[PDB]
């Protein structure tokens, strides 16, 4: 049973942020609640998260590229398989955008990933293992 104000899925719990913070301060805050930033593992997990996000907002996810070499890593250290990614067309787009967000686009309407800046505050998704 997930806590108050935490969406439930499979055997895990998810918190969709309303406040904004940098990628590191987002992972810092997920850790304070004994969780990590979201780590998309299956197609079903991703679609469940999209159903609870605001199309007008971007959401930080535990996927980053620290050195800027497009070496993507998950916070929970699990392997990255590009074929199971939800990158928008044109994305990733810039070596200096080192952190992945879930964002919605209007033409055409599509949920997907986008590498954006890490310091610029955004919303985030914490994933807690129950
Ligand atoms: C349209 C879009 O995704 N805007 C987001 C914006 O994006 C940058 C850049 O990261 C994208 O690769 C390109 C794609 O055209 O658009 C912009 O130049 O980043 C913002 C945060 O940095 C998001 O809030 C916007 O949603
Ligand atoms: Ca997960
Ligand atoms: Ca981008």
From Swiss-Prot:
Expression by tissue: Expressed preferentially in hematopoietic tissues. Expressed in all circulating Ag-presenting cells such as dendritic cells, myeloid cells, monocytes, macrophages, B-cells and epidermal Langerhans cells (at protein level). Expressed in peripheral blood leukocytes, neutrophils, moderate quantities in spleen, lymph node, and bone marrow, and at very low levels in thymus.
Originating organism: Homo sapiens
GN (gene name): CLEC4A
Subcellular location(s) of the protein: Cell membrane
Subunit relationships: May interact with PTPN6 via its ITIM motif.
Record-annotated C-type lectin domain positions: 9-127
Keyword Signal: no
GO biological process, one term: negative regulation of cytokine production
Main location: membrane
Positions that bind N-acetyl-D-glucosamine: 103-105
Binding site for Ca(2+) 1: 39, 41, 45, 127
Organism taxonomic ancestry: Eukaryota, Metazoa, Chordata, Craniata, Vertebrata
Protein residues bound to Ca(2+) 2: 91, 93, 97, 114-115
Glycosylation sites: 81
Record's bilayer topology term: Single-pass type II membrane protein
Cellular-component GO terms for this entry: external side of plasma membrane; plasma membrane
GO molecular function annotations of the record: calcium ion binding; carbohydrate binding; D-mannose binding; pattern recognition receptor activity; transmembrane signaling receptor activity
Record function comment: C-type lectin receptor that binds carbohydrates mannose and fucose but also weakly interacts with N-acetylglucosamine (GlcNAc) in a Ca(2+)-dependent manner. Involved in regulating immune reactivity. Once triggered by antigen, it is internalized by clathrin-dependent endocytosis and delivers its antigenic cargo into the antigen presentation pathway resulting in cross-priming of CD8(+) T cells. This cross-presentation and cross-priming are enhanced by TLR7 and TLR8 agonists with increased expansion of the CD8(+) T cells, high production of IFNG and TNF with reduced levels of IL4, IL5 and IL13. (Microbial infection) Involved in the interaction between HIV-1 virus and dendritic cells. Enhances HIV-1 binding/entry and virus infection. Requires ITIM motif-associated signal transduction pathway involving phosphatases PTPN6 and PTPN11, SYK, Src kinases and MAP kinases.
Sites where the protein binds alpha-D-mannopyranose: 91-93, 97
Induction details: TNF alpha, IL-1 alpha, and LPS, down-regulated expression at the surface of neutrophils (at protein level). Expression is decreased in dendritic cells by signals inducing their maturation (e.g. CD40 ligand, TLR9 ligands, LPS, and TNF alpha). Isoform 2: mRNA expression is up-regulated by agonists of neutrophils CSF2/GM-CSF, IL3/interleukin-3, IL4/interleukin-4 and IL13/interleukin-13.
Keywords, sorted A to Z: Adaptive immunity, Calcium, Cell membrane, Disulfide bond, Glycoprotein, Host-virus interaction, Immunity, Innate immunity, Lectin, Membrane, Metal-binding, Signal-anchor, Transmembrane, Transmembrane helix
Extracellular side: 2-130
Protein name per UniProt: C-type lectin domain family 4 member A
Source taxon at top rank: Eukaryota
Cystine connections: 2-13, 30-126, 99-118
Domain notes: Contains 1 copy of a cytoplasmic motif that is referred to as the immunoreceptor tyrosine-based inhibitor motif (ITIM). This motif is involved in modulation of cellular responses. The phosphorylated ITIM motif can bind the SH2 domain of several SH2-containing phosphatases. Involved in the interaction between HIV-1 virus and dendritic cells. Enhances HIV-1 binding/entry and virus infection. Requires ITIM motif-associated signal transduction pathway involving phosphatases PTPN6 and PTPN11, SYK, Src kinases and MAP kinases.
């Amino acid at each position: 049973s997930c806590p108050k104000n935490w969406k439930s899925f499979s055997s895990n719990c998810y918190f969709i942020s309303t406040e904004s913070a940098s990628w590191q301060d987002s992972e810092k805050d997920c850790a304070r609640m004994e969780a990590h930033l979201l780590v998309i593992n299956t197609q079903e997990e991703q679609d469940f998260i999209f159903q609870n996000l605001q199309e007008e907002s971007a959401y930080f996810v535990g996927l980053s590229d620290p050195e800027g070499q497009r070496h993507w890593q998950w916070v929970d250290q699990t392997p990255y398989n590009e074929s199971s990614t939800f990158w928008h067309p044109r994305e990733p787009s810039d070596p200096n955008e080192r952190c992945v967000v879930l964002n919605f686009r209007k033409s055409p309407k599509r949920w997907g990933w986008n590498d954006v800046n890490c310091l610029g505050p955004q919303r985030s998704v914490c994933e807690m293992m129950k």
